[PDB]
Design a protein around this ligand. Structure first.
Ligand code: 6J5
Ligand code: 6J5
Ligand code: ZN
Length: 257
């Protein structure tokens, strides 16, 4: 029954998921003056040419666009990563207002939203095995600011009225996630966690410095989604973000000077 409300939100999670107060929780604030450029980071490789999207699902917390990850079709390699990480899904976190919504922050700045492209390390064979490993997942995180429309997002926003409530899904084939990327792949990286229960400490976070711009109209439509199921009282799907957690004994590394 976790969620994002007063009674079941991030401040409550620790009672069922005590790793909420662990040593490598996400998100974090990225202090741009303290992150250190790491000249040994190898180049980042985003290889999504063969991506095979399947379905879009409202899971009660966000909406997920799922991919076929039964072979190496859309993968992330390089950067801080060893080996090959297969794309399984992407989703977003967003706010009730344009001044909040991202999970990560940059010198305490909140963006309107944050895109997470979730990938798992193919040496562990499946996603469920990978989340039990400290290097099991790699999440590519992309900030959204409100400005000009992002054309490569519009197919997503146009299908949202078909998955308004919890447990609704729709066909979502032939979607190319390359349309969601900014021009630059300059990034920050640190070891962290899932940002929702079960908050497992299994994620290499790779957060792009360059946000994408989306229109007010596009993000307005995210906010028309519902956390509730059909035939239940309406609760708008807004503010599905966890606030920044203590950095503890971690260093954030930059790919760029
Ligand atoms: Cl996150 C997850 C993905 C797939 C299968 C199981 C998963 O969580 C397992 C779990 N739940 N509580 N601790 N580990
Ligand atoms: Cl990807 C996933 C599967 C099961 C439970 C939670 C999951 O992701 C949580 C997360 N981490 N960063 N954003 N969402
Ligand atoms: Zn996420």
């Amino acid at each position: 029954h976790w969620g994002y409300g007063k009674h079941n939100g991030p401040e409550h999670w620790h009672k069922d998921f005590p790793i909420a107060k662990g040593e490598r929780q996400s998100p974090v604030d990225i202090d741009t003056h303290t992150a250190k450029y790491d000249p040994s980071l190898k180049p980042l490789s985003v290889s999504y040419d063969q991506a095979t999207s399947l379905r879009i699902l409202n899971n009660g917390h966000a909406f997920n666009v799922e991919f076929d990850d039964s072979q190496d079709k859309a993968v992330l390699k390089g950067g801080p990563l060893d080996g090959t990480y297969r794309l399984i899904q992407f989703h977003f976190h967003w706010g009730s207002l344009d001044g909040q919504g991202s999970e990560h922050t940059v010198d305490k700045k909140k963006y309107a939203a944050e895109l997470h492209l979730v990938h798992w390390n193919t040496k562990y064979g499946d996603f469920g095995k990978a989340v039990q490993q400290p290097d099991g997942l790699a999440v590519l995180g992309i900030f959204l600011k409100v400005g000009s429309a992002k054309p490569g997002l519009q197919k997503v926003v146009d299908v949202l009225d078909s998955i308004k409530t919890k447990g609704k899904s729709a066909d979502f084939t032939n979607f190319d996630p390359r349309g969601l990327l900014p021009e630059s792949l300059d990034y920050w990286t640190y070891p962290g966690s899932l940002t929702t229960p079960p908050l497992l400490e299994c994620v290499t976070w790779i957060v792009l410095k360059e946000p994408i711009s989306v229109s007010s109209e596009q993000v307005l439509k995210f906010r028309k989604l519902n956390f509730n199921g059909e035939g239940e009282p309406e609760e708008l799907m807004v503010d599905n973000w966890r606030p920044a957690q203590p950095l503890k004994n971690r260093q954030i590394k930059a790919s760029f000077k």
